[PDB]
Symmetry: C3
Subunit: 152 residues, 3 copies
């Protein structure tokens, strides 16, 4: 009765403390390699790797390569690319069917931000996608090394 009321106030204090502490912790974690947008979080590893290796790193970490699905997400991702001044790989490829880019699941793109003239499968060997510091996309050979950015 009167006891439960006291225990509740104690619990209330514990939760409010956690909310304040967690909020501060989130800001700390995201500085300087992460960006939060909606319920998605982009985070860069800070180094470059070929597509296959970059892809494995994200999947093993429980996430996947950056997959911007809107202008808002693309802008958030662009911030990390600008901050590191290094173009990054996206998760999408047209390795299965040339000319048709898809997400790792197989789904067709729901949003794109291709630079003028892209994708152009230059040299007949560009199945991966990179995002420039200006936010635009370009298909690029998967063997090339680009900034690793995963989404969680």
């Amino acid at each position: 009765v009167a006891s439960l009321r006291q225990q509740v106030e104690a619990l209330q204090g514990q939760v409010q403390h956690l909310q304040a502490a967690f909020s501060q912790y989130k800001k700390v974690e995201l500085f300087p390699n992460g960006q939060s947008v909606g319920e998605k979080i982009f985070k860069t590893a800070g180094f470059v790797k070929p597509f296959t290796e970059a892809q494995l790193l994200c999947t093993q970490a429980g996430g996947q390569l950056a997959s911007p699905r809107s202008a808002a997400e693309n802008a958030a991702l662009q911030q990390l690319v600008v901050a590191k001044n290094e173009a990054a790989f996206l998760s999408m490829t047209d390795s299965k069917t040339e000319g048709k880019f898809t997400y790792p699941t197989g789904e067709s793109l729901v949003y794109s931000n291709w630079a003028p003239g892209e994708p152009n499968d230059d040299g007949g060997s560009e199945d991966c996608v990179e995002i420039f510091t200006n936010g635009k996309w370009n298909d690029r050979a998967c063997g090339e090394k680009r900034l690793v950015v995963c989404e969680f």
Copy 2:
């Protein structure tokens, strides 16, 4: 009443497990680029930038440049400077009124740890402040590049 008790008992167990997990992840987070002191957390980006750019990075991240307000805070900040072996910028400047250093809010300093002979406005143009590996402060030209350390 009775059901409410077990409900409170259960929820608190969950909150305390969350507290324990959060405490562990906070220690992990701070290693090796952060330092906690009181309710404040200092975290370095690991690279150098001129004052204006450094200031923007911290503000955009939801914090501000390191602003040690006591010997204890200065000591905590010093650890990061020593770890990176790179002097860092503080948030304070005397741009508005020469010789009068203030925090971003305009408030006058409540603590200082100037090195002997400082501040001296060398060349007649040193309005920013840097902290050395020995913990002492020195006014420095804002255009120079120093370690970026923010506080949250």
Copy 3:
């Protein structure tokens, strides 16, 4: 009473939110320098240091040097070492009594994964332990520099 009911229900909602948000941040934190195994978390500083320096870094951060106590923990640590491609120091040494490796607490090893013929106290001066990218252990001079990996 009905008020306490509402309060308890309110807390349940706040806790569910924290649980979900924290779960996401745990994954974010561990990328790309951490590894979780059981209730233990290994995290690398990303650089090399001699044993004494490495040990101090971990202890001051509230943890200790990597101390795999099972094949499962050793495999998890190995994943991290492979990712960084740099042999790392473990916490154990036989500095007190030659030939008898112990944890920082003085307790004898409960698990080991020595490479064939090791430990061999090569040159009569190897009291520290390093873990290779293949997961095997080798006693090594404490003065040498190895990847710093702490456990929390």
